[PDB]
Every structure is written in C-alpha cells, then in structure tokens.
Amino acid sequence: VQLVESGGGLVQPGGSLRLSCAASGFTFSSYAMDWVRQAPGKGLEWVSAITMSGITAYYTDDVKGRFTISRDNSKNTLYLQMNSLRAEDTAVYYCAKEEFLPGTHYFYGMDVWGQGTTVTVSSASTKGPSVFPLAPSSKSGGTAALGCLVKDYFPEPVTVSWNSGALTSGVHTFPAVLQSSGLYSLSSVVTVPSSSLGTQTYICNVNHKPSNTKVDKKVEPKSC
Amino acid sequence: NLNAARELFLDELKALTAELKVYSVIQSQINAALSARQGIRIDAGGIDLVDPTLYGYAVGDPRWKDSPEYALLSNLDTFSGKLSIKDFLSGSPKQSGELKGLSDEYPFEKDNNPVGNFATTVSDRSR
Amino acid sequence: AIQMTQSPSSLSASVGDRVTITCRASQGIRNDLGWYQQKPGKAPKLLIYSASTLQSGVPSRFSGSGSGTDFTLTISSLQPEDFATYYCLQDYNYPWTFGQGTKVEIKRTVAAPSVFIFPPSDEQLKSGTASVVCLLNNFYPREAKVQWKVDNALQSGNSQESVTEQDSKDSTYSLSSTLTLSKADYEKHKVYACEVTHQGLSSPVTKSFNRGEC
C-alpha cells in the first residue's frame, strides 16, 4: 500500500494550488480518503474527506468555500484544489486512507498516510540569507560560545555545517523563526574551549538550495 | 360497457400495485444499507430497477416486457433502457408524483445518518 | 463544533514508566475516538481506534479506554521508541477534530544553562538592523524565562525564541532568543542585557555588554 503526494510549493496570498495523491497497491475506489495538514511547529488538522464514490465531500471550517476535494477512481488519484490561499494555510499536507469496520462503511480512522507535500503561502520572493558572525565573548581555561546568524532568507530550509563537517561536537542549529517581514531567520552556534579561540579557525557553511546560494563565513574574536 | 369498466379498474389496480412493488425494492436496498451501517448510491452506480429478477421474472422471460412493472418503468421521462433509483423517484408519470433534488448518494454517517433521512423520505411515498 | 482538549500538553518520563494521556470532548462522542502517534518529520501512525481497539502491529503495552467525553491512552511500560507526540481524534461529527497534542519527552536530572550574549556584528549594522542574540546552552527542563533589558528597561514584543529538540546524547535543550531593533534604536542605548530564570539556577543569571566596548 502506498500514497505519494505532489503539487505543493510556493504561492502568494489569493493564489491557487492543486495537490495530487497517487494511490497504489490497494483498491482505491473502495476506500474513503482524507487530507490532513500540519502547520510548522503546530499539531494536526483534519482538512477534508471524500467518499469512495467521489460524490460526497466534507470540510473543516477554516477551509469551506476555498478548498475542493475530489478524486478520479480510474486514475487512482486524490485531489485538493486550494483557492483563495492565505498565509495560515502554510503547512505540510498529508493524504490519508480511511478504514471501515469489516462489512461496513463505518469509518474508524486513517491507517495509511502519505509522506506529505509542503505548501507555503507568502508574499515573499525567494531570497538567499545574509550570514553574520556571532563573535565569541570578550570574557571566559573556560568554555566560549560562538555562532552564525543566518538572517532574512526565503523559503525554508537552510542547512548549516561547521568547518565543512569536521566540527560537529557542541553544535546547535536552531529552528528558524518567521519574522514579520515574511522572511525567515535562524542561528547556528557552537560551544568550544576558550583556549582554541586564537589557534582554531571557525567557519560556518550555510546552504540555501531554493535560492542556489552557499555562504562560508569566518567567525573570529573582536578587535582587541 | 360494464365489463369494460371492471377491466380498466383492474388495470389501474395493477399499475398501483406495481408502483408499490418498486418502492418495496428501493426500500429493501435502503434497509440493507441501514443494517450493514452502510451507504447507498441511487444514481447509475446504484442498482438498476429495470431488472426482471427484482420482480419475479427470470432474465430471458419474454413476458417481462408485457408486465405492469415494465409498463410503469419504461414509460417514465427518465427511462433509458436502464433506470436508477433516482431516475425512478424523480421520473414521471407515476401516482406518487416526483422527488426533485436528491443527491446521487446517501453515505453512512454516525450522527443524523443520511441513509436514515432518505429512508424516511422514501417511506413517505409508499404512503 | 466539537473541540478536543488533551492534557497534559507535554509530559516527562523514563523508560519503564507508566504513562497516561487524557483527551476530553466538549460533547458526547460515544467510542468514536482514535489515538495517533507522530515523530518529528514523519507521518502519523494510527495506534488505537474505537476508543480501545488496538491497530494490528501496535504492541500490547499501548491500551485505550473511555466513553462519552473522557478518554485515556496508556503506555504500561514506556520504551525508547515511544518518545513522540500523541493526538486524539473524534470522528463522531463532521468536522472531525484532533486534540492539540501531547509530547512525551525523555526525563533526566536538572541541568543549568550556560548563558552567552552576542552583540550585533559590525557588518549587520551597515544594513540598518541590529540583532542581539542570547543563547541558553544544554539545559533541563525545557521551561525557561528569558528577559531582555535595555538600560534596565524590560523589553517587550521585539524578540523571538527558538528551541532545539531534546538532544540524543545528553537529553538537554538549548534556546536562542533574538532581540531585534533598528540601527537607530540600537545606537540610542548602552547596556544590553539578557536575564535568564531557570530551575537549575538558584537566582536569575544576567549576561550583558556595553554598546561598542569590545
């Protein structure tokens, strides 16, 4: 049994997307189907269901009159037409097969899920990050913190490594936060011995695949 | 004059008895659904009411076409060789009138089951 | 309509403990309630349906209970694989609705955050914005108050936080608070201070710098 979602991406407020879910390895026309979404950091929200026949659709309140669920049983495919999109619709959208009690149409839950497809609704244009050093403290044979501030990029994700992957101990790369500008921002930091701040070089390597930008950045102490 | 009038009233009584028979067939599909906590399609995906077997006739029996059941069904607006439950219920002419704006299915739900509400709508015509 | 309220929102326990999550409906939903497990960056998995029936393949330590409005997922002897978030779902009425979720985190001894503060880089200040970053590193529990003071003025509504997932090595958390100001407002003040209250710290720890003093 398998469900593969597709059709997610980037769209502006007021725009439209069509999600597809391709079913295989079971009789698609015999089971009811759902969309479930999960916004970043938040929990699960049931969005829509449709009967095996494809004739009767049900919707969660936020979505009524904006989204339309449908299916094509000859194509083994489930659809979600998303119109009048807004920022709050930004989420991973999961496709899910309903199961019935044996010999019934008595629905009890979703026992097979897809891997999900991401939808991002925003006014922002695609933009690479600015990387700034978080330069190690003035005071410290102790331990010192040291980092990179990866600021004003869009959309997610960025990856960050230190000294090309050679430095992994004590690294904490943080979940991004959405700033009020519509752009994301995050910091990666590392804890190292104070002694090394003269000898050891620290470069953070920041990849942002959506903009096709990589940025390497030295982080040295301040001028004294 | 008098024996002719008798036979028209037998033909009227035959036709009504046939209409009631079709409602019985529909109503028993609806109860089959209710029993299995199941939904029912009433469009082309549901049962075909132009089917000899439903009314006691075997498949190739030539007197099926002369039956009062086939007389009723094949004279409706909606008849097209086949006849869905919705086609029959919405079709005219018949003495229970018409039912407009029925959906193509009534699915099992857990509260205010639409199958149950359809059962009631159909039951208020066999009256 | 129907609102599901799980509790607790999160919960700490060790391998072997007996865990118990609760889900409450605002109206009667019979036994028409399921439990799902989710782990980070993965699809949800059905564990229990019809209030108490085990999905096949789910191990016997999981068990479900309840009727009407009050329900209960129970893990009898918690295992490494069970640290995850759990959601309840009612399907008695449309719209079907989920509970807000219950995270099951790994429990350990209290540990204090080492705190660090970072001024804006000179390079950023060319752009016209100033970002001051406070780092709490490797602490437990997750609860923590971080207060920005600018010349002893408690700052409000101009900072954002972010937290790592519990660490695979030492089960700690780390936190980043980022205070954001215009270049203008940054240069108009002198003492930039991050105050950190947390259980492992006997009294609040402050870290600070003075603007421009290396």
Domain boundaries, chain C: 1-108, 109-214
Q: Do domains C1-108 and C109-214 have the same CATH topology?
A: yes
Q: Is B8 helix (H, G, I), strand (E, B) or coil?
A: helix
Partners of C139 in beta bridges: C173
- CB atoms near residue B81 (< 10 Å): 7
Declared resolution, Å: 2.8
| CB distance A112 to A105 below 8 Å | no
Q: Residue A171: which domain range?
A: 124-221
Partners of A133 in beta bridges: A148
Q: Residue B31: which domain range?
A: 1-127
Whole-angstrom CA distances from A194 to B28, C112, C114 are 84, 20, 14
| CB distance C22 to C70 below 8 Å | yes
CATH 2.60.40.10 holds for C1-108: yes
Q: Which amino acid is at C208?
A: S
State the DSSP H helix or E strand holding residue B28, giving kind and residue range, or none if neither: helix B2-35
Residues of B in contact with A55 (CB under 8 A): 41, 43, 103-105
CA distance C59 to chain B (A): 29
Select from C9, C40, B105, C64 the least CA-distant residue to A108. Answer: C64
Q: Which residue of B has its CA nearest to A51?
A: B107
Picking from A88, A123, A158, the residue at the C-terminal end of a domain is A123
Helix crossing, B114-126 with B2-35: angle to 10°? 170
A119-150: b or e for each residue (b if 16 or more CB lie within 10 Å)?
Answer: bbbbebeebbbbbbbbbbbeeeeeebbbbbbb
Looking at the fold, whether A10 and A85 belong to one and the same domain comes out as yes
What class has domain C109-214? mainly beta
DSSP string, chain C: ---EEEE-SEEEE-TT--EEEEEEESS--TT-EEEEEE-TTS--EEEEETTTEEPTTS-TTEEEEEETTEEEEEESS--GGG-SEEEEEE-SSSSPEE---EEEEEP---BPPEEEEEPPPHHHHHHTEEEEEEEEEEEBSS--EEEEEESS-B--SSEEEEEPPPPTTT--EEEEEEEEEEHHHHHT--EEEEEEE-TTSSS-EEEEEETT--
Looking at the fold, whether A3 and A104 belong to one and the same domain comes out as yes
Domain total for chain B?
Answer: 1
Indicate which CATH number applies to the domain containing A147: 2.60.40.10
Q: How many CA atoms lie within 13 A of C25 on its CB side?
A: 27
DSSP string, B42-100: -STTS--S--GGGGT--TT-GGGTTSHHHHHHHTSTT-SSS--HHHHHH-SSSTT----
On whether any CB of chain B is under 8 Å from the CB of C74, the answer is no
Looking at the fold, whether A141 and A87 belong to one and the same domain comes out as no
Residue A163 gets the label, from left (phi > 0), alpha (psi -120 to 50) or beta, of left
Q: How far apart are CA B89 and CA B70, in angstroms?
A: 15
Picking from A123, A158, A193, the residue at the C-terminal end of a domain is A123
| CB distance C114 to C161 below 8 Å | no
Q: How far apart are CA C211 and CA A215, in angstroms?
A: 28
Looking at the fold, whether A133 and A118 belong to one and the same domain comes out as no
Q: Which amino acid is at A28?
A: F
Matching residue, tokens 């008798």: B6
**Cα angle value A208/A211/A216 (rounded, 5°):** 45
As given in the structure block, the two tokens for residue B24 are 């019985």
**Cα angle value A218/C113/A171 (rounded, 5°):** 35
Interface test with B, best of C89, C93, C96, C97 (most B CBs within 10 A): C93
